[PDB]
Design a protein around this nucleic acid. Structure first.
Ligand SMILES: COC(=O)c1c(OC)cc2cc3c(c(O)c2c1C)C(=O)[C@]1(OC)C(=O)C=C(OC)[C@@H](O)[C@]1(O)C3=O
Ligand SMILES: [Mg+2]
Lengths: 114, 120, 56, 209, 122
RNA sequence: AGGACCGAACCGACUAAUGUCGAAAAAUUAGCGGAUGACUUGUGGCUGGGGGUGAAAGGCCAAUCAAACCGGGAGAUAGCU
RNA sequence: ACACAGGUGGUCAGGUAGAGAAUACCAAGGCGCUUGAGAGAACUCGGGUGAAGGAACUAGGCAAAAUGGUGCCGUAACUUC
RNA sequence: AAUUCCUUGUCGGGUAAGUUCCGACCUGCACGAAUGGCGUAAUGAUGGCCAGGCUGUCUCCACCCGAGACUCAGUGAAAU
RNA sequence: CGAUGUCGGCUCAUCACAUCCUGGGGCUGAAGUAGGUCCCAAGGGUAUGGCUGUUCGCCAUUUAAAGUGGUACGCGAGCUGGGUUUAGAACGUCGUGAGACAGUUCGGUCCCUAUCUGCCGUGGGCGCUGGAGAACUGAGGGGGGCUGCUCCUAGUACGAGAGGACCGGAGUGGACGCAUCACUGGUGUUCGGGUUGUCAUGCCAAUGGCACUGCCCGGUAGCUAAAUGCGGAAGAGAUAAGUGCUGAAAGCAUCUAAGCACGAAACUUGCCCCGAGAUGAGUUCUCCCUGACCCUUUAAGGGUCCUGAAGGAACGUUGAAGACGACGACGUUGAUAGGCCGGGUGUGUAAGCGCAGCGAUGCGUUGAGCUAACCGGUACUAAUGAACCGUGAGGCUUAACCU
């Protein structure tokens, strides 16, 4: 409907970087510890992008110290502070779900340099 | 439960539906009027009218895209030459369904469907 | 699964009270030709709303 | 107090400043206009009868067209009724808008829910499905036993069986009002209300407070 | 989403390497355990020099799930595997000293602050 | 070489589901066993009813088997219904 | 007993892939199985896919899923070698 | 124990929990030496038991694709 | 005994109360916490596993609690067939034997298309006294009702100490129910892509068929849970067990005889849903019809002609409504469906051409091409002028009212 689109475009953040799946992206989110409120980085490869306007999302796969972490981020949420593309990746797919069962030298993807 | 679902299953599987709608789209192009069942005629507008809209732009990509459908070079030649420019000003709605009685064999409601020129 | 007494002719008469057919009551006339037909159906000659659509 | 009649137009979410996303339902509540005010002397009870929206002139029949012409209001679609809660009085022809909910904090949204058609007992009443194998002959989603034996000799009234599910008047109680926007004729309530998108809602303040 | 018979990895250095949930604690007919819930486990596989041995019935708090926890803005944090940290079967304050891998902010719950301190991330 | 191995035809019939007023008075579907042998198959023979035949189940002997079928004694007999 | 999903000995037997008369797609040849038309409920049958868990099911892993080819490397207890 | 009634004997193993299984004990209701006793490689659509893999078997079902069911036309049964 | 189906499990139950939990009290050898016992109370709630065919039981681990019974030891025209009750075989034992077990053990066909009652749903007919369109009133009925934990009160009351509250308040779960698709996901054989074998489109290139959607990788809409909203109440009336006030019979005493006040998840309401076939058929608002004649056994009579309202139905386009009916939207004075246009979304850089390379293949054109059910539009196509049904002031009696 038209009333939904008018109510959602009042709420979208208007400065978002244009990244693709396969890109390596550092995301800074707002972490609250009591009254203290800092920023914590979460840098990994982007494996899927849900492109839905205000309901847009993207999940980032980060192989941390011994464990693989997979975190989705609502893009226009005020929790996500900064999105920055560290490295552009060259994959010819939209969803990179095959990366969940690959480690090390098989889970790396080639630079785009387009 | 079928909420907002489109497309008639028509008591076939999906390969039969794609095959027979490929057949009666080419015969609707060839003779410019056919007699069929009324539920089968309403589902033919969702097949043959994108084939006429594909004929508005004569290109090698469109003629191969309209050859991946209909699988018949005589249909690709009557489109893009005799149906593309002939319907080039019509903004959709290239067919017309006219109900014609009931079939004698099984009491099936029948319909004529034709391209809207048929000037003889 | 099966009946225990047989139903009477009175009972199958009451079940068949909805088996009764209904008529059409909606024969039209053509604009030019004058033939009787159904609503939204072409005539036997091939007219619909005063236009020989079928040419056959 | 009295309620208002709106129209469910989709769902969306509101992002608050402290991170929290709240799922809202956008109810479009136009200006309800009173068509009949009922009194104790003429009706045995006091209530108001409002209408909302608009209806085409060739579809408004002559009996109901005279009912709108007596109030002198525009012929909207549908007619609803709200009992006056002993401390409010309304005049015929008054236009009530969504800014009545500007101080209400919880509402009860009554709608007609989605219709599931003929539903089995697994969907309708959350019956446990029998086992898929280990012998089972033609009895997977069947209800099983429906009564006891010769001593009851019957099925009890109100036995949970298959049948029509949904397409039914459902009220969801105590929904938080997120935002009342009188200029866009909007009402955002936190959560899900009954019905599909485009259906009539009856929004009234929550009696459970 | 941990139920009975679920095999979990072990996130501290207590000695166990693979444990199996035998009960989800707190409330009747409770089917699942999230990422801050306490389960009863048995130890199916341990290291030789550990503080716990195979076949031992004690408690554990779930710290990681493949299903994951949902933050209050829609966001979900999923892991590659279910992990837990072994408790003391009649008290809190876990047996192990080091804690491996990340944890979640939901574990910051006034009695697992020992686990928040010893964890390398989150 | 082999009552060897895997595996079609062919011969069997272990499990499951369907069917069970069946499509069928025992099958179908999906798997299953043997598959150069104490194998299997065509044609023609031989064994006949207290008899045959039986790697033996009281199995089989024309959809019938703790004594076949047909005709006769015969309207057996029935303190039973 | 049927215009019956069964039974019936022998002969001929191509192309591409394949070890192959397996299997898949085709040739020669032969067919669409003698009620159709719609709709897209429960439920039943035959299937497909499934979050997290992974036999907790159950009399019993019944059923389903899985394994699967060729070359090479490698292979324990036990043994009548 | 294909044998044991008391009995789920006792003890050990495996399990968080084991009337089953395995190992042992001997008080063998009522084992036993060609109506064979005790072993045994290989074998088995054989009986029990455990483990890995695997999974809608299940927690707990959801959705989809077809065939019926439902409606229309033609034909047209059955048990009782 | 011319058939009434055996154990347990599954699925689904329903009732009782001799009450397991929650609730209200009396007594205690009741300090508090926690109990014991008795009384009242059936509103709701009342485990998962290991072993075994088992009910049971033992054990492990839970839980506020893991209640006891009745209902053909509920439930096989609902399922199973492990147990025992057929035919095979063997062991122990008994018997000379055929065979048989206070016995073990391995194997072993579970049919029914629902006429009636009942029940879940959903229609048709008629009635409700002129017809019709709406909105209601509510008799009556149904659903729902469970509870933990932490904190505050307060380490206060209590106690030598260890311990540790009542009464109130806040927060948060488990189980269960309803709704929903905004998010997280499943599905998505109608969307896009990759790839194997083979056949075909004359061939290359490009595509199509078939092989379970050939095998797969994603994925729109819808549907849906694991997803996330909400609910269980407070209050009120009458009480149970119980505690009382005043008070005699019986100068006192005494909760009771007169009178009076409290008192529980039970009862009646409050909350949600159905509901005037509630034949006691209700109420309100609005709309429509105010023509002639004849005939007879003159009656709430029959017949002809003219008329044909409001409204309904039928038909068509349909729907987040649906088995069919029904229900909702629309029918040209029209966005109802299809198409079309723009967008979105999904998939990941189409074909053709050019370039680089021996070639496979890469690069450029190019986030390209295609894109279902989605959104916003747009009369291009199909929703027809009609006809059909339903009428022509609506009984009697009595009262009160204008005449
Ligand atoms: C106690 O358990 C029974 O009540 C029972 C049973 O429980 C499932 C099944 C059956 C099955 C059957 C029979 C039964 O008696 C029987 C019995 C008694 C027969 O008598 C049978 O005819 C039907 C026949 O005459 C000869 C045969 O073998 C010689 C059988 O195979 C037979 O064919 C059959 O199927
Ligand atoms: Mg037999």
């Amino acid at each position: 409907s038209n009333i939904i689109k008018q109510l959602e475009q009042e709420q979208m953040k208007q400065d978002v970087p244009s990244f693709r799946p396969g890109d390596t992206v550092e995301v800074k989110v707002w972490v609250v510890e009591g009254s203290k409120k800092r920023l914590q980085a979460f840098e990994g490869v982007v494996i899927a992008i849900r492109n839905r306007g205000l309901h847009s999302a993207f999940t980032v796969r980060k192989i941390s110290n011994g464990e693989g972490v997979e975190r989705v981020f609502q893009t226009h949420s005020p929790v996500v502070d900064s999105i920055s593309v560290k490295r552009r990746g060259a994959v010819r797919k939209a969803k990179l779900y095959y990366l969940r069962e690959r480690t090390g030298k098989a889970a790396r993807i080639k630079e785009r340099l387009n | 439960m079928r909420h907002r679902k489109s497309g008639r299953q028509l008591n076939r599987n999906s390969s039969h539906r794609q095959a027979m709608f490929r057949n009666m789209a080419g015969s609707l192009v060839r003779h410019e009027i056919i007699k069929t069942t009324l539920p089968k005629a309403k589902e033919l507008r969702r097949v043959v009218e994108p084939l006429i809209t594909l004929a508005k732009t004569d290109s090698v990509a469109n003629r191969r895209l309209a050859f991946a459908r209909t699988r018949d070079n005589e249909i690709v030649a009557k489109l893009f030459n005799e149906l593309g420019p002939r319907f080039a000003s019509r903004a959709g709605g290239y067919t017309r369904i006219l109900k014609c009685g009931f079939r004698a064999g099984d009491n099936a409601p029948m319909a004529y469907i034709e391209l809207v020129d048929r000037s003889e | 699964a099966v009946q225990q007494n047989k139903p009477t002719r009175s009972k199958r008469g009451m079940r068949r009270s909805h088996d009764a057919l209904t008529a059409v009551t909606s024969l039209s006339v053509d604009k030019t030709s004058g033939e009787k037909h159904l609503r939204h159906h072409i005539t036997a000659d091939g007219y619909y709303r005063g236009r020989k659509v079928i040419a056959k | 107090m009295i309620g208002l009649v709106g129209k469910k137009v989709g769902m969306t979410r509101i992002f608050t400043e402290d991170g929290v996303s709240i799922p809202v339902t956008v109810i479009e509540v136009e200006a309800n206009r009173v068509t009949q005010v009922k009194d104790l002397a003429n009706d045995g009870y006091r209530a108001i009868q409002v209408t909302t929206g608009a209806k085409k002139a060739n579809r408004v029949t002559k009996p109901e067209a005279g009912h709108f012409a007596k109030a002198g209001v525009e012929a909207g679609r549908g007619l609803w009724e709200f009992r006056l809660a002993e401390g409010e009085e309304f005049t015929v022809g008054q236009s009530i808008s969504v800014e009545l909910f500007a101080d209400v904090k919880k509402v009860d949204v009554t709608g007609t829910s989605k219709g599931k058609g003929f539903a089995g007992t697994v969907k309708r009443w959350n019956f446990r499905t029998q086992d898929a194998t280990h012998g089972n002959s033609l009895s997977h989603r069947v209800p099983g036993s429906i009564g006891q034996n010769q001593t009851p000799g019957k099925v009890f009234k109100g036995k949970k069986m298959a049948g029509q599910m949904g397409n039914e008047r459902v009220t969801v109680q105590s929904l938080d009002v997120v935002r009342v926007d009188a200029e866009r004729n909007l009402l955002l309530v936190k959560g899900a209300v009954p019905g599909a998108t485009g259906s009539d809602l009856i929004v009234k303040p929550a009696v459970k407070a | 989403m941990i139920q009975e018979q679920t095999m979990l990895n072990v996130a501290d250095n207590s000695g166990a390497r693979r444990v199996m949930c035998i009960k989800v604690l707190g409330g009747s007919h409770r089917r699942y355990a999230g990422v801050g819930d306490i389960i009863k486990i048995t130890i199916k596989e341990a290291i030789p020099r550990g503080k716990v041995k195979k076949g031992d019935v004690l408690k554990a708090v779930v710290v990681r799930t493949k299903k994951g926890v949902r933050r209050p803005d829609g966001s979900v944090i999923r892991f590659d595997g279910n992990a837990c940290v072994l408790l003391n079967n009649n008290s809190e304050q876990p047996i192990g000293t080091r804690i491996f891998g990340p944890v979640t902010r939901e574990l910051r719950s006034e009695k697992f602050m020992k686990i928040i301190s010893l964890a390398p991330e989150v």
